[PDB]
Design a protein around this ligand. Structure first.
Ligand SMILES: *P(=O)(O)OCC(C)(C)[C@@H](O)C(=O)NCCC(=O)NCCSC(C)=O
Lengths: 78, 410
């Protein structure tokens, strides 16, 4: 699966976690914090994406991304 | 062989800050911290430190003991990430001001917020070793957040102060431990740390993911050792290290989803029944580090239902990291004893700081920075706070003289 495909899955769960962003555009340089999703929900998004992709690895391996594009990259690499 | 907590006593500080005032002062929505289940954090005054917090936590336990039973305390373990010396344990001061026996092993234990559980397990093993039949251990988890005015800014809303004292023995009136029912898991990770005195550094997002990984793995280790255990059916309540309530809700949800494939409404009902009782006192003190899981246990006991004996599952985490899942049982009698401690009343009688007083307190905290050789405390820094302490038989830090800390009962 591609970086761009993964990014679309991240966008879906972000909009699901934060319904006020249903219609707004989401750039790969947007950060969940500035959007601004709270600490628990930022982890929830990561875990939903993991489960969607059946990725059974330590959650900490998805830490450290500064924006959703970098998060897409992180997932893409696994 | 019977073992566990014979007595439990808490000190939640002399003052607290309402997080809604912190939000209003940062022009955040008041619901931000409500969303995260945070209400108040306890705040240490300059004339308090982890020793005074520890002594105030333990004093009621020692006060109730016979001279004979007090002399049976032969180990004092202080569990902290807020130490005051690189070599001298706080246990020496604690022994001095509680009047404990000189025939006593004394030391301090460190692994972020896992410290308390580690101390408790060591005390348990002393009892189980049967090396000294009748000996008791005093384990005190004690921590403050003395941040000076940052690396620590991320943690300001959550970083509290408190201590919980445990007396551990072969007559566990409060919490009877399930012996051998332990799972643990850890690895090196830079999630948060305290690499400079009076500070903290970290990536909170990494720490939450690490907490979740450990919650799953420590429990799986327990499950591998305790045949037939079920995450819903075997535990009447669940207590957790609680950096803030919202993340405990998230962890419980993750566990229920994975282990029980539970649906969202079912998970939220289970949360309210089994986890919310433990969060009640935690929400009034904030993250009190190594003591938080023990405060959650005390909260579960006061706020849950103990009309028949109940099993509580305990999850401990400390950044860095290490974690443990373990369990025990509380009876109706134990719950009745714990209720007499009056924790809720203690917490309600603390001084409610304004944002102005809080900012001044941060500023004045520098006087008692780590490494201070000489300082004489002004107890009238905040006259109104003093009025809430004076006459209650509280220990406070009076002075440091040539690095020697001196305390006073006020
Ligand atoms: P997010 O919505 O960005 O908010 C994070 C908050 C809760 C504001 C922040 O204060 C936080 O995440 N604090 C928790 C960090 C922490 O202390 N974790 C627990 C470790 S206890 C320990 C030292 O082991």
């Amino acid at each position: 699966m591609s970086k761009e495909q993964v990014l679309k899955i991240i966008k879906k769960y972000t909009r699901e976690i934060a319904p006020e962003l249903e219609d707004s555009p989401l750039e790969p340089t947007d950060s969940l914090k500035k959007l601004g999703i709270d600490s628990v929900n930022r982890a929830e998004i990561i875990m939903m994406v993991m489960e969607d992709l059946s990725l059974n690895i330590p959650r900490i391996e998805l830490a450290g991304a500064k924006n959703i594009g970098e998060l897409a990259d992180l997932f893409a690499a696994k | 062989q019977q073992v566990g907590i014979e007595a439990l006593s808490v000190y939640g500080g002399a003052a607290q800050l309402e997080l809604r005032k912190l939000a209003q002062a940062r022009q955040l929505d008041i619901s931000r911290f409500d969303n995260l289940m945070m209400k108040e954090k306890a705040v240490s005054l300059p004339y308090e430190d982890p020793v005074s917090y520890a002594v105030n936590a333990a004093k009621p336990i020692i006060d109730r003991l016979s001279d004979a039973d007090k002399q049976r305390i032969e180990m004092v373990i202080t569990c902290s990430e807020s130490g005051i010396d690189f070599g001298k344990s706080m246990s020496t001061y604690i022994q001095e001001y509680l009047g404990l026996s000189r025939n006593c092993r004394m030391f301090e234990l460190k692994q972020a917020s896992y410290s308390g559980t580690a101390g408790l397990q060591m005390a348990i093993n002393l009892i189980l070793s049967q090396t000294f039949p009748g000996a008791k251990a005093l384990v005190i988890a004690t921590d403050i957040s003395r941040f000076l005015v940052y690396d620590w800014s991320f943690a300001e809303p959550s970083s509290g102060a408190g201590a919980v004292a445990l007396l551990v023995s072969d007559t566990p009136h409060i919490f009877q431990i399930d012996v051998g029912c332990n799972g643990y898991y850890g690895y090196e990770v830079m999630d948060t740390c305290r690499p400079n005195p009076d500070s903290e550094a970290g990536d909170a997002d990494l720490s939450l993911l690490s907490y979740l990984d450990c919650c799953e793995n420590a429990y799986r280790h327990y499950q591998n050792r305790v045949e037939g255990v079920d995450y819903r059916e075997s535990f009447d309540y669940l207590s957790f290290h609680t950096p803030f309530g919202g993340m405990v809700k998230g962890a419980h949800r993750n566990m229920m989803r994975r282990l029980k494939r539970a649906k969202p409404a079912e998970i939220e009902a289970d949360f309210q029944r089994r986890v919310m009782p433990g969060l009640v006192y935690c929400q009034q003190v904030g993250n009190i580090m190594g003591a938080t899981l023990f405060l959650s246990l005390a909260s579960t006991i006061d706020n849950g239902d103990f009309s028949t004996p109940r099993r509580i599952g305990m999850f401990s985490y400390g950044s860095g990291c290490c974690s443990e899942f373990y369990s025990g049982v509380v009876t109706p009698e134990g719950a009745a004893i714990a209720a007499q401690q009056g924790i809720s009343a203690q917490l309600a009688d603390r001084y409610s700081l304004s944002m102005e007083e809080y900012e001044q307190l941060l500023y004045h905290s520098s006087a008692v920075a780590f490494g201070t050789r000489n300082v004489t405390l002004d107890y009238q820094l905040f006259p109104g706070v003093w009025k809430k302490i004076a006459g209650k038989g509280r220990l406070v830090l009076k002075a440091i003289k040539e690095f020697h800390r001196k305390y006073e009962w006020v």
